[PDB]
Design a protein around this ligand. Structure first.
Ligand code: CA
Length: 223
């Protein structure tokens, strides 16, 4: 997250870190046994880390649970990033409390102008590299589809939305991928892609979760 603020420990209780020896992507806990992330975060050998603030220090609220199954969306296209969504089943159920909690799936899609919360452990610089150890947060609005398509001609599908600031300076970034965009207490987006980070006229692009609720629910019910 570029241009954000330190969230505070366990203030984003649905945020998870995906670990394969190191943090490589975010995700969101949607019930005691399932996480949603970006398909472009797929790899084998995932450990899901819940209850994290500092990802390099054991602070006492963590739960570390291995994945038993991963399911990339049937229509994910790695060249265009259309359908950039993946489900991960945990080997055992997490213990839910105030500091580790699920986030609700949306019943309706959010409109442009809605303010959302984006979070992650990704790069904090637009030029160069500095990775934080504690969770960072950013409040940002959903942008109109017209502004999104004007910023990225030929690249925005109906399964994507833009959020952020056209003036630059505030955005998600590498290492935030897979993490949540929460608006009015519902998971509306997944950190997916963008051109650089925090550049003028290049806002972040997010997977539009409301298009996937039926697939998520049916997949969880049968796996
Ligand atoms: Ca920790």
């Amino acid at each position: 997250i570029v241009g954000g603020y330190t969230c505070g420990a366990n203030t984003v209780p649905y945020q998870v870190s995906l670990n394969s020896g190191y943090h490589f992507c975010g995700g969101s806990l949607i019930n005691s046994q399932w996480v949603v992330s970006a398909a472009h975060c797929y790899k084998s050998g995932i450990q899901v880390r819940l209850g994290e603030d500092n990802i390099n220090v054991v602070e006492g609220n963590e739960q570390f649970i291995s994945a038993s199954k991963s399911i990339v969306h049937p229509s994910y296209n790695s060249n265009t990033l259309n359908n950039d969504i993946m489900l991960i089943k945990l080997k055992s159920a997490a213990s839910l409390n105030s500091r580790v909690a699920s986030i609700s799936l949306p019943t309706s899609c959010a409109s442009a102008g809605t303010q959302c919360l984006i979070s992650g452990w990704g790069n904090t610089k637009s030029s160069g590299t500095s990775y934080p150890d504690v969770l960072k947060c950013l409040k940002a609005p959903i942008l109109s589809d017209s502004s999104c398509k004007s910023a990225y001609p030929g690249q925005i599908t109906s399964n994507m939305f833009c959020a952020g600031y056209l003036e630059g300076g505030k955005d998600s970034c590498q290492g935030d991928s897979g993490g949540p965009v929460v608006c009015s207490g519902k998971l509306q987006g997944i950190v997916s892609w963008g051109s650089g980070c925090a550049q003028k006229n290049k806002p972040g692009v997010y997977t539009k979760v409301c298009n996937y609720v039926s697939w998520i629910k049916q997949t969880i019910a049968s796996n």
